[PDB]
């Protein structure tokens, strides 16, 4: 019975694996998620553990699913776990290693800023059961765990390390603008970049918003939009930028008042 | 003579015996039609031949296409014989007797409705068994399409039999009694279709009818007029208010409201409904007519929505669409699934007669998306107000509603890009909340259901507008906390709403909700942040 048991379990597990991969390739994300649950619990029960090809393709699917889910951390994690498995494969091209390391670092950059607390229960936390994560590895933790690892930092394209220098090495607003002018031209040449423009842009602009709230606390709006405006790929309609700020404000990063009668924005911090 | 009577009677007696070979009984009747020459022989042969077939296939799921197709041939042949006879088989009026040879059956009873009424019933079987096939075939197979091709030929027999009844019957009290039912069937076979398809069925029905005409509407002459179809419907409609059966009267009224709410203006339909006074009635008149009433409620809920009346729409549909079981309440459920449930078959006829064939179905996804779009436009600004800090207008607590499903989507561990239609509607709602109306329109146009409306472009832009308005409202409601002042010019440009609308909406809302907001029309600028609910409580504490 234990033989028939082990075999039937294996059948059912592979069955769910391809229900996941087919679902993802077929753009059904609910059946994909549900089948992924089914996979997780099965492996917890399973004695015989999966063959590496299937796990690699598993993370290959999980990266897409967690992309479109709106959670950058899980994305990043399954993308890492694809790396760790792919270094074992006989056909590995340096271009690919570079691409994937790069993309991991970007997904770390694209991550929304975890520093400002979330009041209440986040349902997304449950999903972390799936990847072994007990709680969210904050954008800091992600940056650390990424640059810490040899191969990852090692294979990253220079433009991206440069980006990390633009954003995270003593960031000053105007200087960041100027750096972005030159660096974006060199950056957009490479394939991986296409998908990350939006969350990246939002992160940048958030940083800009906070630095602007600290540096001058009462201003004309027309003066604010110039600073808030970014270069070519990150360009935004005026009101769109207004609402990026609005987002940041309702997120309680910056406590703001706005009087448009005089076209003024007033930052008052009285804590 | 006596050969014929004795044979026929032996057969009829043998039929009332349990063990019989029905194939052989049918074949015997037929082989004895071969011999018959005299017309009373023919007619009295057919009169027991038709039900002999129906009875033979009676205990099956339905009678198959071949046996049905040949029984049609039977009824059409009896009709051709009765037509070529021209009522002269009865020896006129003054002398009724059927005499030749009544002594052999000996069981004759004087009547017209009695001997010549049975005819209609035959036709009805043809129809009923026919429906039983459309329920039992696969909804998407080509076979279903062929059966539906047979529907027209049944409508033919309805009209023809009607016309023979008109020529024959000399007593108006009997003629009405006889005509009520085929008028009913005639209606059932028309109302759910387009004016075109109906006039097709009608034209086709009139082309197969010869020099015989007696009818009230007089269609043979007037066939081409555009007032034709409407006058047929309102004609039989007005007729059925005479009959004493209440289920028939309500039936008629409901067919009116359906057809009208489809091919005619909505207001007419509404007037009909409120004037017709059926409420305490409908509840007690069983299942099928309630399926019909829910069908017409749905239909006016739909056309009122085509008119871009949201407030009306949500008013209409809420009772029926709060039902979990709505698919069943609309009498659309696959027969098979409840065919296992309802067995035994004897009492299964009851539940199986309640569900409807496919071509008469109203796609549920269309209905649900419609109502949910409504409940969105309606409930979103009031919600936005409430949870962003203004509650003066809110005491809804919404049964089985868009808001509750919002509450359940927020609580999901996983949030996927929208796939099911309620998810697209959902994304449109959250989009409204954040104030991107463009995104919401995009997410709403990804819904497939909108393709089932012939006016779709019109309602696309109409909805785009109503959405522009309500999303402007929602925006204002949510963001008035961090804004002390606003610019009507910018707002107008960015929502793509001309200022006349903007100032109107905003002013009307602030005046209705008692919001501490001030507008200068001269400079077109707005003002807020005074407060509050709690500050009025501060004041109330301070005065006393």
Author numbering:
A (entry chain A): 225 to 495
B (entry chain C): 251 to 794
Show the paper's wording.
Eukaryotic translation initiation requires the recruitment of the large, multiprotein eIF3 complex to the 40S ribosomal subunit. EIF3 is a large and structurally complex molecular assembly that, in the majority of eukaryotes, consists of 11–13 subunits (eIF3a-eIF3m) with a molecular weight of 600–800 kDa. We present X-ray structures of all major components of the minimal, six-subunit Saccharomyces cerevisiae eIF3 core. Yeast eIF3 engages 40S in a clamp-like manner, fully encircling 40S to position key initiation factors on opposite ends of the mRNA channel, providing a platform for the recruitment, assembly, and regulation of the translation initiation machinery.
Using the full eIF3a PCI-domain structure as a guide, N-terminal eIF3a truncations were generated to obtain crystals of a dimeric eIF3a/eIF3c assembly, encompassing the full predicted PCI domain of eIF3c (S. cer. residues 251–812) and residues 228–496 of eIF3a. As expected, the PCI domain of eIF3c shares the basic architecture of the fold but with a more elaborate helical domain that extends over 450 residues. The helical domain can be subdivided into two regions: helical-element 1 (HE-1) is composed of helices 1–7, whereas helical element 2 (HE-2) contains helices 9–13. HE-1 and HE-2 form TPR-like right-handed superhelices similar to those found in other PCI proteins, with the relative orientations of HE-1 and HE-2 defined by helix 8, which disrupts the helical repeat at the HE-1/HE-2 interface, inducing an almost 90° bend in the domain. An extensive, conserved protein segment formed by a 40 amino acid insertion between helices 13 and 17 meanders back into the HE-1/HE-2 interface to further stabilize the kink. The dimerization interface between eIF3a and eIF3c involves two distinct interaction regions. Helix 23 in the WHD of eIF3a engages the WHD of eIF3c in an arrangement similar to the Thp1-Sac3 PCI-dimer (Ellisdon et al., 2012). The second interaction interface between eIF3a and eIF3c involves a loop between helices 18 and 19 of eIF3c that engages a cleft formed by helices 11, 12, and 15 of eIF3a, allowing a stacking interaction between residue F664 of eIF3c and Y257 of eIF3a. This interaction induces a rearrangement of up to 3 Å at the end of eIF3a helix 15 to accommodate the eIF3c loop.
